[PDB]
Amino acid sequence: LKCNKLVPIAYKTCPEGKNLCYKMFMMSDLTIPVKRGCIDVCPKNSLLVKYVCCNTDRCN
């Protein structure tokens, strides 16, 4: 899977073990994010942050 970095411009292949791309949004998601990378299993989301996991190339 191809996951992007903080910016939706540069992205790479989420390596062996991590084939999922997620993007955590602080305060609110409606806005622009705070952090986003790859993962294997989506963590527990919070009320202060929004955990948006995906499995699509360039999802984040």
Curated annotation (Swiss-Prot):
The keyword Membrane applies. Keywords: Cardiotoxin, Cytolysis, Disulfide bond, Membrane, Secreted, Target cell membrane, Target membrane, Toxin. Gene3D superfamilies: CD59 (2.10.60.10). Pfam families: Toxin_cobra-type. PROSITE patterns: SNAKE_TOXIN. One of its GO terms (biological process) is killing of cells of another organism. Signal peptide: none annotated. Its main location: secreted. It is found in: Secreted; Target cell membrane. Disulfide bonds join C3-C21, C14-C38, C42-C53, C54-C59. GO terms for cellular component: extracellular region; membrane; other organism cell membrane. Expressed by the venom gland. GO terms for molecular function: toxin activity. This three-finger cytotoxin is a basic protein that interacts and penetrates into the cell membrane, with the tips of all the three loops. Cytotoxins which have a 'Pro-30' (P-type) interacts with membrane stronger that those which have a Ser-28 (S-type). CTI interacts with membrane weaker than CTII. Belongs to the three-finger toxin family. Short-chain subfamily. Type IA cytotoxin sub-subfamily. Monomer in solution; Homodimer and oligomer in the presence of negatively charged lipids forming a pore with a size ranging between 20 and 30 Angstroms. This is Cytotoxin 1.
